[PDB]
Design an enzyme around this catalytic site. Structure first.
Site, mmCIF file in Angstrom:
data_model
loop_
_atom_site.group_PDB
_atom_site.id
_atom_site.type_symbol
_atom_site.label_atom_id
_atom_site.label_comp_id
_atom_site.label_asym_id
_atom_site.label_seq_id
_atom_site.Cartn_x
_atom_site.Cartn_y
_atom_site.Cartn_z
ATOM 1 N N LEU A 170 0.908 -1.432 0.328
ATOM 2 C CA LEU A 170 -0.590 0.008 -0.032
ATOM 3 C C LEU A 170 0.699 0.950 0.763
ATOM 4 C CD1 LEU A 170 -2.604 1.512 0.082
ATOM 5 C CD2 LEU A 170 -3.234 1.225 2.881
ATOM 6 N N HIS A 171 1.983 0.843 0.424
ATOM 7 C CA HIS A 171 2.651 2.462 0.872
ATOM 8 C C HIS A 171 3.519 2.720 -0.822
ATOM 9 C CE1 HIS A 171 6.780 4.620 1.190
ATOM 10 N NE2 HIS A 171 7.214 3.749 1.396
ATOM 11 N N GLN A 172 3.927 1.728 -1.121
ATOM 12 C CA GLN A 172 4.531 1.433 -2.207
ATOM 13 C C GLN A 172 3.947 2.303 -3.072
ATOM 14 O OE1 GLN A 172 6.991 2.224 -4.572
ATOM 15 N NE2 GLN A 172 8.267 1.257 -2.984
#
Lengths: 78, 309, 187, 78, 77
Positions: free
Chosen positions: C28-30
C-alpha cells in the site's frame, strides 16, 4: 548431583570414534552425539559441551588419550 | 482380527533438499551456472543469520528432484499375515474402485502453484515453475506453469495439469518409473530478503552470547529442508470437520496445525486416521468416498502404526 | 470520504495475520507513493484497544472513482489470494472525530550518544555520563514489521487513534505521511 | 535392590583392562561389556551407564584408581 | 578456568564445515561462529581468534586435520 557432567566414550563397534553425553541437573540434555574420529575432536567436543550447558561448576570424564589434550587438571574441573 | 504390533510404511513422494540460486530475469532459459546465495552473520547484542540476494540479481531460483515409487498398500514390516492380507485386499478394493487420480491431481496442483516457496511467495511479483521428466539422463517432457494464475484455494482444471496428473498417477500405480526435476523462479526484488529453512539444534546451550537464529546450508549454499518440501506438497486435505474458509491443511493423523496451536480431527470425534482405518479393515465400514482419499494419502505419507496388544 | 474499501483477511494457517498485514501495508505504501494523489486516508477498524493487537480490517478514503480503482488495484498487486477485499459502497456519516496518526519513540540511547558525539557537542566520554541510562525506555503498542526499500533495515511503526469526542467535526488533512496523518470518518 | 547397580572390574587374564556390569530392578541389563584399557575410560563408561540406565537412583562401584576420577561421593551415589 | 579457551568443532549436520567457540574468564565471548569449508580456513580462524580475546594463555583445540596446519609451539600458550 549438582555440576553438569560431560562424558566422552569410545564406541567399540568401530574403534577410533567417540561419543559425548551431557547431564545438567537430573536430566539428560545430550545423548550420544558424534564427537569425532580422533582424540582431538573428542576433546574439542567435550570442551564445547562444557562451555555451554554449564553452571559455575562442571566435570569432564574421558580416556587417558583424550584427557591429554585438555590442560592438566586445570580446565577439567570447576 | 487384531491390529499388528509392528506396522511400518515406506515413504513415497521422496524429495531432496532444495537448492537456492540468484540471477536476473529474462535469463531463465540459460540459468545453469547461477551463483548460490550464502548465509551471513549480522549483529543486532545478539548475532543472527540472514540471507539476501546480490545487488545485481532480482530473481530467485529453487531446484530439487522428486520420485514416486508405487505399491502404496504393501507395508514394510508386519507381525501377522492375516492383517496384512486384509489390508492388501482393502487397498486393492480401493484402487479397483478408483485409481490414484484425485490425489495425483492435487499433487500436480501443489506442484503447479509454487507452494514449496513458503514465505518468499507472498511478496512475489511473478512466479514461473518448470517441471522436467527425466527418462535416461535427458529430458522426455517439459511442463511450464504460471503459479500466480493457479491459485491456492480452489482446484481448477487445465490440460497440462491433467497430463502431469496422468504422469504422477502412472508413477503411483506401478506401471512406470517417474523422476521429476522441479525448478521455480520467483521475482522477489532487487536485493530483497529470501527465507531459507531455519535450523533446530538440540545441543545448543542456554548461556548468553550464543547465536539466536541460524539458517540451513549445504556446503556454503543456502538451502531448504526436504521435510519442509514434503509438508508443502502434502497439503491436499480439505475434508475435515471445520467450516470452509480456512483452507486445506496437511495430511497428518489427528490433522493438526501445531504453529497455530489447534488440532483438528480430535479422537473424541470419529474423524481421525486411526479409527476410520480400524473400521475399514476390521468392521468392513467404508466411511465415505472422501475419507478414503484421506486414509490412502496417510498411507502414501507413511508412519509407524502399531497397537500394543 | 465516500469511497471506502473494507478488506477482511482470510484466515490462513501457514501465516500469522500481522505478518500479512505488514506485506499489505508495504504494498500500500509503495503503490501509494507511486501515484499522483497526495492525500489518501487510511483507517484501521476492529481496533481492539484492550489486548494490544492491531485489527484484521483496513479501509481507504480517496475522493475519486479512478483513484479508488487505482488503489483497489494497488494493495492487490500480485497477491490475489490473501486479501479477500470488498466493494466500494456508500459510507454512513457519524464522523466521531477519530484521527489516526503516526508516533515515534526513542529506545536506543546509543544513537543519541552518536548524535551527541559526532554532530554538535564534540567529545568522547561526556556523552555517556551526562544524559543516558538504562531507564526511561519507551514503548508503543500497535506494531508493523515494515522492511525498508532504499538501503534500510527492519523498523517498527506505531500509530494512534485519537480522541473520539462526539461534539463536532473538525476539518483535517486526509493523509500526512505514508498512509494516514489526519482524521477519518469512523464506523 | 531399588537403584541401578554399576560395577567396574579389572580382567585378571590381562592386567590393565576393565569391564562393566549394569543391573536394574533385579534384571541384569548389561553383562560384561568392554570399558577400556585405562581407568579414565572405565570411569566415563560407568558414568554413562549411570546416566542412561537407572533414572531415579544409582550406585557406582569400582576400584580406587577408577573412582578417583569421579568426584568423591557427590556423584557416586544418588 | 583462567586461560581463554578456543575450540574448533566440525558441524555434523553437514560434513566439512567448522565452527569456533571462544570463552574468556568464565563467560563466553564467541558462540558457534562460522569458519571455512576446509581445515586451512578453520585453523586460520582459530589463530585469529587466539590473537584477539586472549593475550595471555590461550588454548586452541581441534581435530588432527585442523591442528596440522599450525606449528606445535602455537597450540598452547
Amino acid at each position: 548431583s549438582r555440576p553438569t557432567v560431560v562424558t566422552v566414550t569410545e564406541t567399540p563397534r568401530n574403534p577410533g570414534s567417540y561419543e559425548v553425553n551431557v547431564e545438567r541437573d537430573g536430566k539428560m540434555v545430550v545423548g550420544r552425539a558424534r564427537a569425532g574420529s580422533d582424540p582431538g575432536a573428542a576433546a574439542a567436543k567435550a570442551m564445547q559441551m562444557a562451555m555451554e550447558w554449564g553452571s559455575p561448576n562442571y566435570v569432564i570424564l574421558g580416556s587417558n588419550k583424550v584427557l591429554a589434550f585438555i590442560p592438566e587438571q586445570l580446565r577439567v574441573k570447576m | 482380527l487384531s491390529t499388528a504390533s509392528v506396522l511400518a510404511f515406506e515413504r513415497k513422494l521422496d524429495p531432496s533438499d532444495a537448492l537456492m540460486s540468484a540471477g536476473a530475469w529474462a535469463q531463465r532459459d540459460a540459468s545453469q551456472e547461477w551463483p548460490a546465495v550464502t548465509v551471513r552473520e549480522k549483529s543486532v547484542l545478539q548475532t543472527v543469520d540472514v540471507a539476501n540476494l546480490p545487488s545485481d540479481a532480482d530473481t530467485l531460483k529453487v531446484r530439487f528432484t522428486l520420485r514416486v515409487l508405487g505399491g502404496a498398500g504393501t507395508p514394510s514390516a508386519c507381525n501377522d499375515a492375516a492383517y496384512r492380507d486384509k489390508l492388501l485386499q482393502t487397498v486393492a478394493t480401493y484402487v479397483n474402485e478408483q485409481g490414484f487420480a484425485e490425489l495425483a491431481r492435487r499433487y500436480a496442483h501443489n506442484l503447479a502453484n509454487a507452494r514449496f516457496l513458503w514465505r518468499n511467495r507472498v511478496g512475489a511479483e511473478a512466479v514461473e515453475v518448470r517441471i522436467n521428466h527425466i527418462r535416461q539422463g535427458e529430458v522426455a517432457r517439459t511442463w511450464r506453469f504460471d503459479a500466480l494464475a493457479i491459485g491456492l484455494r480452489d482446484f481448477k482444471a487445465d490440460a497440462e495439469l491433467d497430463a502431469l496428473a496422468e504422469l504422477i498417477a502412472s508413477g503411483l500405480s506401478g506401471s512406470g518409473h517417474v523422476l521429476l526435476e522441479v525448478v521455480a523462479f520467483a521475482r522477489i526484488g532487487d536485493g530483497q530478503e529470501v527465507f531459507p529453512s531455519q535450523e533446530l539444534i538440540l545441543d545448543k546451550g542456554d548461556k548468553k552470547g550464543q547465536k539466536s537464529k541460524t539458517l540451513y546450508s549445504v556446503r556454503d549454499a543456502a538451502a531448504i529442508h526436504s521435510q519442509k518440501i514434503g509438508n508443502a506438497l502434502r497439503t491436499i486435505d480439505t475434508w475435515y470437520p471445520d467450516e470452509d474458509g480456512l483452507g486445506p491443511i496437511a495430511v497428518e493423523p489427528y490433522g493438526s496445525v501445531t504453529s497455530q496451536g489447534k488440532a483438528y480431527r480430535q479422537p473424541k470425534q470419529k474423524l481421525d486416521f486411526y479409527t476410520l482405518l480400524d473400521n475399514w479393515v476390521l468392521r468392513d465400514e467404508a466411511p465415505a468416498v472422501e475419507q478414503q482419499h484421506y486414509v490412502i494419502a496417510n498411507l502414501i505419507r507413511g508412519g509407524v502404526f502399531g497397537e500394543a496388544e | 470520504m465516500d469511497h471506502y474499501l473494507d478488506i477482511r483477511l482470510r484466515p490462513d494457517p501457514e501465516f500469522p495475520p500481522a505478518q500479512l498485514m505488514s506485506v499489505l501495508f508495504g504494498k500500500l505504501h509503495q503503490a501509494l507513493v507511486a501515484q499522483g494523489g497526495d492525500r489518501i486516508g487510511v483507517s484501521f477498524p476492529d481496533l481492539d484497544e484492550s489486548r494490544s493487537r492491531l485489527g484484521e480490517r483496513l479501509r481507504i478514503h480517496a475522493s475519486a472513482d479512478d483513484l479508488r480503482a487505482l488503489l483497489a488495484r494497488p494493495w492487490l498487486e500480485g497477491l490475489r489470494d490473501h486479501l479477500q477485499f470488498g466493494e466500494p459502497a456508500v459510507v454512513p456519516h457519524p464522523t466521531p472525530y477519530r484521527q489516526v496518526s503516526r508516533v515515534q519513540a526513542k529506545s536506543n540511547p546509543e544513537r543519541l550518544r552518536r548524535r551527541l558525539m559526532r554532530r554538535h557537542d564534540l567529545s568522547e566520554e561526556e556523552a555517556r555520563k551526562r544524559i543516558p541510562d538504562t531507564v526511561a525506555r519507551t514503548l508503543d503498542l500497535p506494531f508493523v514489521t515494515l522492511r525498508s526499500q532504499s538501503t534500510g533495515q527492519h523498523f517498527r511503526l506505531f500509530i494512534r487513534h485519537g480522541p473520539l469526542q462526539a461534539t463536532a467535526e473538525e476539518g483535517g488533512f486526509t493523509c500526512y505521511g505514508l498512509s494516514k496523518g489526519g482524521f477519518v470518518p469512523w464506523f
